[PDB]
Structures are given as C-alpha cells and as structure tokens.
PDB file of C-alpha atoms and ligand atoms in Angstrom:
ATOM      1  CA  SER A  19     -40.912 -83.793-154.096  1.00  0.00           C
ATOM      2  CA  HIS A  20     -40.686 -86.856-156.492  1.00  0.00           C
ATOM      3  CA  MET A  21     -36.943 -87.295-155.569  1.00  0.00           C
ATOM      4  CA  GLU A  22     -37.563 -87.658-151.835  1.00  0.00           C
ATOM      5  CA  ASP A  23     -40.277 -90.346-152.359  1.00  0.00           C
ATOM      6  CA  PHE A  24     -38.085 -92.025-154.750  1.00  0.00           C
ATOM      7  CA  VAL A  25     -35.001 -92.092-152.443  1.00  0.00           C
ATOM      8  CA  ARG A  26     -37.283 -93.302-149.602  1.00  0.00           C
ATOM      9  CA  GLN A  27     -38.836 -96.147-151.668  1.00  0.00           C
ATOM     10  CA  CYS A  28     -35.466 -97.117-153.418  1.00  0.00           C
ATOM     11  CA  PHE A  29     -32.889 -97.318-150.576  1.00  0.00           C
ATOM     12  CA  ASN A  30     -33.176 -99.213-147.342  1.00  0.00           C
ATOM     13  CA  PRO A  31     -34.398 -97.301-144.381  1.00  0.00           C
ATOM     14  CA  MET A  32     -31.191 -97.497-142.333  1.00  0.00           C
ATOM     15  CA  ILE A  33     -29.353 -96.113-145.339  1.00  0.00           C
ATOM     16  CA  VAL A  34     -32.000 -93.265-145.683  1.00  0.00           C
ATOM     17  CA  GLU A  35     -31.575 -92.467-141.955  1.00  0.00           C
ATOM     18  CA  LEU A  36     -27.935 -92.297-141.970  1.00  0.00           C
ATOM     19  CA  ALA A  37     -27.971 -90.110-145.096  1.00  0.00           C
ATOM     20  CA  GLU A  38     -30.541 -87.704-143.344  1.00  0.00           C
ATOM     21  CA  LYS A  39     -28.276 -87.615-140.267  1.00  0.00           C
ATOM     22  CA  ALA A  40     -25.229 -86.964-142.140  1.00  0.00           C
ATOM     23  CA  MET A  41     -26.754 -84.163-144.188  1.00  0.00           C
ATOM     24  CA  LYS A  42     -28.420 -82.404-141.494  1.00  0.00           C
ATOM     25  CA  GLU A  43     -25.389 -82.729-139.518  1.00  0.00           C
ATOM     26  CA  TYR A  44     -23.518 -80.666-142.150  1.00  0.00           C
ATOM     27  CA  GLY A  45     -26.513 -78.086-142.525  1.00  0.00           C
ATOM     28  CA  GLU A  46     -28.168 -79.466-145.553  1.00  0.00           C
ATOM     29  CA  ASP A  47     -31.797 -80.679-145.435  1.00  0.00           C
ATOM     30  CA  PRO A  48     -32.806 -83.880-147.376  1.00  0.00           C
ATOM     31  CA  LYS A  49     -36.217 -82.509-148.249  1.00  0.00           C
ATOM     32  CA  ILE A  50     -34.822 -79.611-150.192  1.00  0.00           C
ATOM     33  CA  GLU A  51     -31.487 -80.578-151.612  1.00  0.00           C
ATOM     34  CA  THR A  52     -33.017 -83.851-152.845  1.00  0.00           C
ATOM     35  CA  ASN A  53     -30.358 -84.538-155.406  1.00  0.00           C
ATOM     36  CA  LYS A  54     -27.575 -84.465-152.666  1.00  0.00           C
ATOM     37  CA  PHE A  55     -30.005 -86.678-150.745  1.00  0.00           C
ATOM     38  CA  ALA A  56     -29.942 -89.353-153.435  1.00  0.00           C
ATOM     39  CA  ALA A  57     -26.293 -89.104-153.848  1.00  0.00           C
ATOM     40  CA  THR A  58     -25.631 -89.493-150.053  1.00  0.00           C
ATOM     41  CA  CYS A  59     -27.639 -92.622-150.026  1.00  0.00           C
ATOM     42  CA  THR A  60     -25.989 -93.949-153.361  1.00  0.00           C
ATOM     43  CA  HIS A  61     -22.532 -93.241-151.720  1.00  0.00           C
ATOM     44  CA  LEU A  62     -23.630 -95.042-148.526  1.00  0.00           C
ATOM     45  CA  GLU A  63     -24.841 -98.152-150.228  1.00  0.00           C
ATOM     46  CA  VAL A  64     -21.805 -98.344-152.532  1.00  0.00           C
ATOM     47  CA  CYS A  65     -19.600 -98.163-149.393  1.00  0.00           C
ATOM     48  CA  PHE A  66     -21.540-100.892-147.672  1.00  0.00           C
ATOM     49  CA  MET A  67     -21.379-103.381-150.628  1.00  0.00           C
ATOM     50  CA  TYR A  68     -17.855-102.685-150.938  1.00  0.00           C
ATOM     51  CA  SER A  69     -17.041-103.476-147.318  1.00  0.00           C
ATOM     52  CA  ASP A  70     -19.254-106.633-147.730  1.00  0.00           C
ATOM     53  CA  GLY A  71     -16.869-107.699-150.408  1.00  0.00           C
ATOM     54  CA  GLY A  72     -13.915-109.758-149.359  1.00  0.00           C
ATOM     55  CA  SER A  73     -13.641-111.549-146.140  1.00  0.00           C
ATOM     56  CA  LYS A  74     -15.854-110.930-142.939  1.00  0.00           C
ATOM     57  CA  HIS A  75     -13.472-108.553-141.190  1.00  0.00           C
ATOM     58  CA  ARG A  76     -11.245-107.173-143.766  1.00  0.00           C
ATOM     59  CA  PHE A  77     -12.674-103.518-143.870  1.00  0.00           C
ATOM     60  CA  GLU A  78     -13.149-101.084-141.041  1.00  0.00           C
ATOM     61  CA  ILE A  79     -16.207 -98.859-142.284  1.00  0.00           C
ATOM     62  CA  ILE A  80     -15.441 -95.126-141.627  1.00  0.00           C
ATOM     63  CA  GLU A  81     -18.458 -93.725-143.382  1.00  0.00           C
ATOM     64  CA  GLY A  82     -21.757 -93.597-141.676  1.00  0.00           C
ATOM     65  CA  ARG A  83     -20.238 -92.861-138.239  1.00  0.00           C
ATOM     66  CA  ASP A  84     -20.563 -89.654-136.474  1.00  0.00           C
ATOM     67  CA  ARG A  85     -17.702 -87.198-136.972  1.00  0.00           C
ATOM     68  CA  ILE A  86     -15.966 -87.581-133.906  1.00  0.00           C
ATOM     69  CA  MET A  87     -16.467 -91.221-133.557  1.00  0.00           C
ATOM     70  CA  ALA A  88     -15.203 -91.631-137.122  1.00  0.00           C
ATOM     71  CA  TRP A  89     -12.044 -89.844-136.402  1.00  0.00           C
ATOM     72  CA  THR A  90     -11.634 -91.779-133.099  1.00  0.00           C
ATOM     73  CA  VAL A  91     -11.612 -94.974-135.277  1.00  0.00           C
ATOM     74  CA  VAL A  92      -8.976 -93.475-137.698  1.00  0.00           C
ATOM     75  CA  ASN A  93      -6.782 -92.442-134.820  1.00  0.00           C
ATOM     76  CA  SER A  94      -7.037 -95.924-133.456  1.00  0.00           C
ATOM     77  CA  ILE A  95      -6.279 -97.512-136.659  1.00  0.00           C
ATOM     78  CA  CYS A  96      -3.331 -95.217-137.128  1.00  0.00           C
ATOM     79  CA  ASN A  97      -1.749 -96.004-133.751  1.00  0.00           C
ATOM     80  CA  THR A  98      -2.358 -99.640-134.200  1.00  0.00           C
ATOM     81  CA  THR A  99      -0.897-100.167-137.682  1.00  0.00           C
ATOM     82  CA  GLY A 100       1.590 -97.146-138.044  1.00  0.00           C
ATOM     83  CA  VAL A 101       0.034 -95.323-141.080  1.00  0.00           C
ATOM     84  CA  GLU A 102      -0.142 -91.681-141.448  1.00  0.00           C
ATOM     85  CA  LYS A 103      -3.335 -89.909-140.190  1.00  0.00           C
ATOM     86  CA  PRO A 104      -5.066 -88.646-143.429  1.00  0.00           C
ATOM     87  CA  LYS A 105      -5.963 -84.959-143.408  1.00  0.00           C
ATOM     88  CA  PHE A 106      -9.433 -85.605-144.607  1.00  0.00           C
ATOM     89  CA  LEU A 107     -11.679 -88.417-143.433  1.00  0.00           C
ATOM     90  CA  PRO A 108     -11.526 -91.598-145.551  1.00  0.00           C
ATOM     91  CA  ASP A 109     -14.470 -94.118-146.237  1.00  0.00           C
ATOM     92  CA  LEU A 110     -12.729 -97.577-145.279  1.00  0.00           C
ATOM     93  CA  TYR A 111      -9.578 -99.087-144.039  1.00  0.00           C
ATOM     94  CA  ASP A 112      -8.221-102.148-145.754  1.00  0.00           C
ATOM     95  CA  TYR A 113      -6.813-104.430-143.134  1.00  0.00           C
ATOM     96  CA  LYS A 114      -5.494-106.895-145.941  1.00  0.00           C
ATOM     97  CA  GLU A 115      -3.467-104.059-147.751  1.00  0.00           C
ATOM     98  CA  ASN A 116      -2.860-101.830-144.751  1.00  0.00           C
ATOM     99  CA  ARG A 117      -4.350 -98.652-146.285  1.00  0.00           C
ATOM    100  CA  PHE A 118      -7.308 -96.206-145.943  1.00  0.00           C
ATOM    101  CA  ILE A 119      -9.627 -96.172-149.056  1.00  0.00           C
ATOM    102  CA  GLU A 120     -11.555 -93.273-150.443  1.00  0.00           C
ATOM    103  CA  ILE A 121     -14.718 -94.355-152.552  1.00  0.00           C
ATOM    104  CA  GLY A 122     -16.305 -92.183-154.994  1.00  0.00           C
ATOM    105  CA  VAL A 123     -19.520 -92.327-157.101  1.00  0.00           C
ATOM    106  CA  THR A 124     -19.405 -89.688-159.961  1.00  0.00           C
ATOM    107  CA  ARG A 125     -21.571 -88.818-163.012  1.00  0.00           C
ATOM    108  CA  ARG A 126     -18.626 -87.266-164.994  1.00  0.00           C
ATOM    109  CA  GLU A 127     -16.150 -90.039-166.177  1.00  0.00           C
ATOM    110  CA  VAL A 128     -13.582 -91.831-163.978  1.00  0.00           C
ATOM    111  CA  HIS A 129     -10.896 -89.587-165.367  1.00  0.00           C
ATOM    112  CA  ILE A 130     -12.327 -86.256-164.047  1.00  0.00           C
ATOM    113  CA  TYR A 131     -13.379 -87.341-160.725  1.00  0.00           C
ATOM    114  CA  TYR A 132     -10.268 -89.529-160.165  1.00  0.00           C
ATOM    115  CA  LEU A 133      -8.262 -86.473-161.208  1.00  0.00           C
ATOM    116  CA  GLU A 134     -10.071 -84.127-158.774  1.00  0.00           C
ATOM    117  CA  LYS A 135      -9.939 -86.604-155.831  1.00  0.00           C
ATOM    118  CA  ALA A 136      -6.245 -87.401-156.336  1.00  0.00           C
ATOM    119  CA  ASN A 137      -5.443 -83.682-156.359  1.00  0.00           C
ATOM    120  CA  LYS A 138      -7.622 -83.085-153.282  1.00  0.00           C
ATOM    121  CA  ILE A 139      -5.701 -85.925-151.467  1.00  0.00           C
ATOM    122  CA  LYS A 140      -2.218 -84.407-152.004  1.00  0.00           C
ATOM    123  CA  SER A 141      -0.928 -87.114-149.802  1.00  0.00           C
ATOM    124  CA  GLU A 142      -1.005 -90.081-152.222  1.00  0.00           C
ATOM    125  CA  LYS A 143      -0.985 -92.644-149.255  1.00  0.00           C
ATOM    126  CA  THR A 144      -4.838 -93.066-149.290  1.00  0.00           C
ATOM    127  CA  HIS A 145      -5.997 -95.479-151.980  1.00  0.00           C
ATOM    128  CA  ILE A 146      -8.619 -94.154-154.245  1.00  0.00           C
ATOM    129  CA  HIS A 147     -11.516 -95.992-155.929  1.00  0.00           C
ATOM    130  CA  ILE A 148     -13.951 -94.429-158.255  1.00  0.00           C
ATOM    131  CA  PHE A 149     -17.256 -95.989-159.710  1.00  0.00           C
ATOM    132  CA  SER A 150     -19.596 -94.377-162.161  1.00  0.00           C
ATOM    133  CA  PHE A 151     -23.159 -94.689-163.112  1.00  0.00           C
ATOM    134  CA  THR A 152     -22.056 -96.022-166.591  1.00  0.00           C
ATOM    135  CA  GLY A 153     -20.293 -99.228-165.534  1.00  0.00           C
ATOM    136  CA  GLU A 154     -16.824 -97.857-165.591  1.00  0.00           C
ATOM    137  CA  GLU A 155     -14.331 -97.678-162.570  1.00  0.00           C
ATOM    138  CA  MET A 156     -10.859 -96.359-161.958  1.00  0.00           C
ATOM    139  CA  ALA A 157      -8.661 -97.026-158.987  1.00  0.00           C
ATOM    140  CA  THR A 158      -5.112 -96.112-157.710  1.00  0.00           C
ATOM    141  CA  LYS A 159      -2.085 -98.053-159.272  1.00  0.00           C
ATOM    142  CA  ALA A 160      -4.865 -99.773-161.029  1.00  0.00           C
ATOM    143  CA  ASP A 161      -5.380-101.904-157.886  1.00  0.00           C
ATOM    144  CA  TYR A 162      -9.136-102.493-157.590  1.00  0.00           C
ATOM    145  CA  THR A 163      -8.841-104.082-154.176  1.00  0.00           C
ATOM    146  CA  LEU A 164     -11.849-106.517-154.583  1.00  0.00           C
ATOM    147  CA  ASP A 165     -12.512-109.392-157.068  1.00  0.00           C
ATOM    148  CA  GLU A 166     -14.269-108.828-160.410  1.00  0.00           C
ATOM    149  CA  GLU A 167     -17.695-110.071-159.181  1.00  0.00           C
ATOM    150  CA  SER A 168     -18.122-107.698-156.275  1.00  0.00           C
ATOM    151  CA  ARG A 169     -17.300-104.714-158.407  1.00  0.00           C
ATOM    152  CA  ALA A 170     -19.758-106.002-161.095  1.00  0.00           C
ATOM    153  CA  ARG A 171     -22.488-106.138-158.405  1.00  0.00           C
ATOM    154  CA  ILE A 172     -21.843-102.530-157.399  1.00  0.00           C
ATOM    155  CA  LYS A 173     -21.893-101.420-161.112  1.00  0.00           C
ATOM    156  CA  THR A 174     -25.112-103.240-161.739  1.00  0.00           C
ATOM    157  CA  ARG A 175     -26.802-101.587-158.678  1.00  0.00           C
ATOM    158  CA  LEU A 176     -25.691 -98.175-159.897  1.00  0.00           C
ATOM    159  CA  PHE A 177     -27.108 -98.695-163.396  1.00  0.00           C
ATOM    160  CA  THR A 178     -30.322-100.069-162.022  1.00  0.00           C
ATOM    161  CA  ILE A 179     -30.734 -96.877-159.904  1.00  0.00           C
ATOM    162  CA  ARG A 180     -29.939 -94.732-162.926  1.00  0.00           C
ATOM    163  CA  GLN A 181     -32.639 -96.349-165.038  1.00  0.00           C
ATOM    164  CA  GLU A 182     -35.166 -96.101-162.080  1.00  0.00           C
ATOM    165  CA  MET A 183     -34.426 -92.256-161.801  1.00  0.00           C
ATOM    166  CA  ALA A 184     -34.980 -91.876-165.586  1.00  0.00           C
ATOM    167  CA  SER A 185     -38.310 -93.956-165.458  1.00  0.00           C
ATOM    168  CA  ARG A 186     -39.360 -91.321-162.957  1.00  0.00           C
ATOM    169  CA  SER A 187     -37.854 -88.437-165.232  1.00  0.00           C
ATOM    170  CA  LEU A 188     -35.451 -87.558-162.355  1.00  0.00           C
ATOM    171  CA  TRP A 189     -32.265 -88.597-164.117  1.00  0.00           C
ATOM    172  CA  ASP A 190     -31.826 -85.419-166.048  1.00  0.00           C
ATOM    173  CA  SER A 191     -31.780 -83.003-163.146  1.00  0.00           C
ATOM    174  CA  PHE A 192     -29.658 -85.432-161.124  1.00  0.00           C
ATOM    175  CA  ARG A 193     -26.912 -85.731-163.928  1.00  0.00           C
ATOM    176  CA  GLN A 194     -26.799 -82.078-164.466  1.00  0.00           C
ATOM    177  CA  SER A 195     -26.538 -81.307-160.525  1.00  0.00           C
ATOM    178  CA  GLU A 196     -23.179 -82.810-159.957  1.00  0.00           C
TER     179      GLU A 196
HETATM  180  C1  QQ4 B   1     -23.204-101.932-137.109  1.00  0.00           C
HETATM  181  C2  QQ4 B   1     -24.519-101.006-137.138  1.00  0.00           C
HETATM  182  C3  QQ4 B   1     -24.824-100.511-138.655  1.00  0.00           C
HETATM  183  C4  QQ4 B   1     -23.763-100.676-139.684  1.00  0.00           C
HETATM  184  C5  QQ4 B   1     -24.296-100.915-141.177  1.00  0.00           C
HETATM  185  C6  QQ4 B   1     -23.730-102.081-141.987  1.00  0.00           C
HETATM  186  C7  QQ4 B   1     -24.880-102.333-142.967  1.00  0.00           C
HETATM  187  C8  QQ4 B   1     -24.712-103.802-143.819  1.00  0.00           C
HETATM  188  C9  QQ4 B   1     -25.555-104.889-143.200  1.00  0.00           C
HETATM  189  C10 QQ4 B   1     -25.559-106.184-143.833  1.00  0.00           C
HETATM  190  C11 QQ4 B   1     -25.156-107.458-142.984  1.00  0.00           C
HETATM  191  N1  QQ4 B   1     -26.765-106.634-144.531  1.00  0.00           N
HETATM  192  C12 QQ4 B   1     -26.749-107.609-145.631  1.00  0.00           C
HETATM  193  C13 QQ4 B   1     -28.173-107.959-145.932  1.00  0.00           C
HETATM  194  C14 QQ4 B   1     -28.879-106.759-145.533  1.00  0.00           C
HETATM  195  C15 QQ4 B   1     -28.195-106.135-144.348  1.00  0.00           C
HETATM  196  O1  QQ4 B   1     -28.512-105.343-143.785  1.00  0.00           O
HETATM  197  N2  QQ4 B   1     -25.354-103.515-145.223  1.00  0.00           N
HETATM  198  C16 QQ4 B   1     -24.532-103.848-146.396  1.00  0.00           C
HETATM  199  C17 QQ4 B   1     -25.488-103.710-147.680  1.00  0.00           C
HETATM  200  C18 QQ4 B   1     -26.601-102.720-147.297  1.00  0.00           C
HETATM  201  C19 QQ4 B   1     -26.520-102.797-145.701  1.00  0.00           C
HETATM  202  O2  QQ4 B   1     -27.211-102.211-145.058  1.00  0.00           O
HETATM  203  N3  QQ4 B   1     -23.246-103.329-141.343  1.00  0.00           N
HETATM  204  C20 QQ4 B   1     -22.137-104.062-141.566  1.00  0.00           C
HETATM  205  C21 QQ4 B   1     -21.780-104.892-140.315  1.00  0.00           C
HETATM  206  C22 QQ4 B   1     -23.057-105.151-139.827  1.00  0.00           C
HETATM  207  C23 QQ4 B   1     -24.038-103.977-140.210  1.00  0.00           C
HETATM  208  O3  QQ4 B   1     -25.048-103.711-139.720  1.00  0.00           O
HETATM  209  N4  QQ4 B   1     -22.927 -99.523-139.831  1.00  0.00           N
HETATM  210  C24 QQ4 B   1     -23.508 -98.144-139.753  1.00  0.00           C
HETATM  211  C25 QQ4 B   1     -22.228 -97.279-140.052  1.00  0.00           C
HETATM  212  C26 QQ4 B   1     -21.097 -97.991-139.744  1.00  0.00           C
HETATM  213  C27 QQ4 B   1     -21.394 -99.423-139.658  1.00  0.00           C
HETATM  214  O4  QQ4 B   1     -20.649-100.326-139.650  1.00  0.00           O
HETATM  215  N5  QQ4 B   1     -24.312 -99.893-136.437  1.00  0.00           N
HETATM  216  C28 QQ4 B   1     -23.039 -99.574-135.628  1.00  0.00           C
HETATM  217  C29 QQ4 B   1     -23.507 -98.605-134.586  1.00  0.00           C
HETATM  218  C30 QQ4 B   1     -24.748 -97.828-135.229  1.00  0.00           C
HETATM  219  C31 QQ4 B   1     -25.230 -98.765-136.157  1.00  0.00           C
HETATM  220  O5  QQ4 B   1     -26.249 -98.838-136.690  1.00  0.00           O
HETATM  221  C1  QVV B   2     -20.817 -86.359-152.517  1.00  0.00           C
HETATM  222  C2  QVV B   2     -19.597 -85.753-151.465  1.00  0.00           C
HETATM  223  C3  QVV B   2     -20.619 -85.148-150.206  1.00  0.00           C
HETATM  224  N1  QVV B   2     -18.758 -84.704-151.825  1.00  0.00           N
HETATM  225  C4  QVV B   2     -18.984 -86.811-150.866  1.00  0.00           C
HETATM  226  N2  QVV B   2     -18.428 -86.645-149.417  1.00  0.00           N
HETATM  227  C5  QVV B   2     -17.655 -87.682-148.989  1.00  0.00           C
HETATM  228  C6  QVV B   2     -17.013 -87.579-147.565  1.00  0.00           C
HETATM  229  O1  QVV B   2     -16.517 -88.358-147.086  1.00  0.00           O
HETATM  230  N3  QVV B   2     -17.508 -86.457-146.700  1.00  0.00           N
HETATM  231  C7  QVV B   2     -16.829 -86.535-145.363  1.00  0.00           C
HETATM  232  C8  QVV B   2     -17.899 -85.670-144.515  1.00  0.00           C
HETATM  233  N4  QVV B   2     -18.454 -84.470-145.255  1.00  0.00           N
HETATM  234  C9  QVV B   2     -17.608 -83.466-145.560  1.00  0.00           C
HETATM  235  N5  QVV B   2     -18.440 -82.592-146.237  1.00  0.00           N
HETATM  236  C10 QVV B   2     -19.698 -83.229-146.437  1.00  0.00           C
HETATM  237  C11 QVV B   2     -21.000 -82.847-147.030  1.00  0.00           C
HETATM  238  N6  QVV B   2     -21.188 -81.594-147.567  1.00  0.00           N
HETATM  239  N7  QVV B   2     -21.950 -83.631-146.980  1.00  0.00           N
HETATM  240  C12 QVV B   2     -21.738 -84.766-146.214  1.00  0.00           C
HETATM  241  N8  QVV B   2     -20.829 -85.216-145.632  1.00  0.00           N
HETATM  242  C13 QVV B   2     -19.742 -84.377-145.729  1.00  0.00           C
HETATM  243  C14 QVV B   2     -17.221 -88.731-149.777  1.00  0.00           C
HETATM  244  O2  QVV B   2     -16.323 -89.870-149.319  1.00  0.00           O
HETATM  245  C15 QVV B   2     -17.698 -88.760-151.280  1.00  0.00           C
HETATM  246  O3  QVV B   2     -17.248 -89.972-152.097  1.00  0.00           O
HETATM  247  N9  QVV B   2     -18.582 -87.882-151.638  1.00  0.00           N
HETATM  248 MN1   MN B   3     -16.726 -90.254-146.829  1.00  0.00          MN
HETATM  249 MN1   MN B   4     -16.325 -91.132-150.446  1.00  0.00          MN
END
C-alpha cells in the first residue's frame, strides 16, 4: 500500500521498528492496518519530542518499551517517589512535577479526545496532554508542562505530516479512520 511506503519514508527507522513491534505485539499487522501504523509512529515521535523538551533527565520515557519492562519502570518510579500506580500504562513520568503523563494525538478536537481520555483515566492523578493535527492542544489544569517553543515544534511537525499525507491523497482515509 501507499500508506506503508509513506510511513517508512516519513518517520525515522527506529520509530518505524518500534511501531511495528508494538503493533504485532498486540496482534495488529502494520502492512494491513496501515492507518493505525501511521498513528503509532506519530504518537511515538510526539512522545520523543516531548521527552526531548525540558532538561536532560526530566522525563522517564514509558512508551516504546516492552510491556513488562514498561511496568517494571512504573513500579520502580512508584516505590521511589510514592505516587499511586496508574491502572493503565502512561507515556511519561515528569520528575520535575512528580507525575505520570498521558500524551494523545487525535484528529477530533482537543475537547472530544480530552474528554474521552479524562473519563478513561477515572483516577485524575495522571496528567493529560493532547495535541491535534490542527495546531490545538489541551492539557490538565491548563498546565502544559513544557515551554511554548517545544510545543510549537510538535504542532508544526504534526501539520507537516498532515500536508504530506494529503499530497499523497492519504489524509482523507486517515482522518476518517479515527
Ligand atoms: C535508549 C534507546 C532508544 C530510545 C529512543 C530515544 C530517541 C530520541 C533520540 C534523540 C537523542 N535524537 C535526537 C536527534 C536524532 C535522535 O535520534 N529521539 C527523539 C526524537 C526522535 C528520536 O529518535 N532516545 C532518548 C534518549 C536517547 C535515545 O535514544 N528509547 C526507545 C524506547 C524508550 C527509549 O528511551 N533504547 C533503550 C533500549 C532499547 C533502545 O533502543
Ligand atoms: C492510538 C492508541 C493505540 N489508542 C493509543 N495507545 C496508547 C497506549 O499507551 N497504549 C498502551 C499499549 N496498548 C494498549 N492497547 C494498544 C494497541 N491497540 N495498540 C498499541 N499499543 C497498545 C496511547 O498512549 C495513545 O495516546 N494512543
Ligand atoms: Mn502509551
Ligand atoms: Mn498516549
């Protein structure tokens, strides 16, 4: 398919392999559910740009690790700091603010996905931060964790990926697939 070739020539190889591993590891094949393949790569790259923002060792990356190793690091962070173990695996831990962070990338408005994720949490201790493909963002207690410039970089990247998909006439099915 067109989407698979585009994902491979758009994102960096480390990201593509981690996305492939994470999808097969949960029974989905990147060569078929190509829209979910693009979205796993996007979520991965956004998470890595986020963790790059801030100081050197501010964020402990949870996403991208294998399941049991990811939970190993959460349990370790929990017994280290004293925070409660979330029931669902988050994406980061903020050592500066002492909180796990769930990062989301949606194509249906910051209000809809923020509302869904906040209801999914049902344990309000986990900080939530949503980006969209339209430049908009919404975050818990309006606390956006990073400075304006890092978030603006993430947003720019998201919009460049959106235009690249449309240039290949892939954007439409991708926006309707979420
Ligand atoms: C540690 C290693 C892999 C890391 C991946 C993550 C990638 C990070 C790299 C940065 C630097 N830049 C910037 C210039 C290009 C580049 O590459 N960024 C950020 C943007 C895109 C990207 O790629 N980081 C961050 C620390 C060093 C590193 O590599 N991962 C994988 C999942 C968890 C994790 O931390 N590990 C650990 C064992 C297996 C493995 O592969
Ligand atoms: C977009 C998506 C997958 N929804 C999503 N997932 C996570 C996440 O953490 N998943 C933890 C592991 N996991 C569970 N089910 C999974 C599945 N079907 N595919 C891959 N990984 C899965 C996010 O953080 C996020 O922003 N978006
Ligand atoms: Mn995740
Ligand atoms: Mn996430």
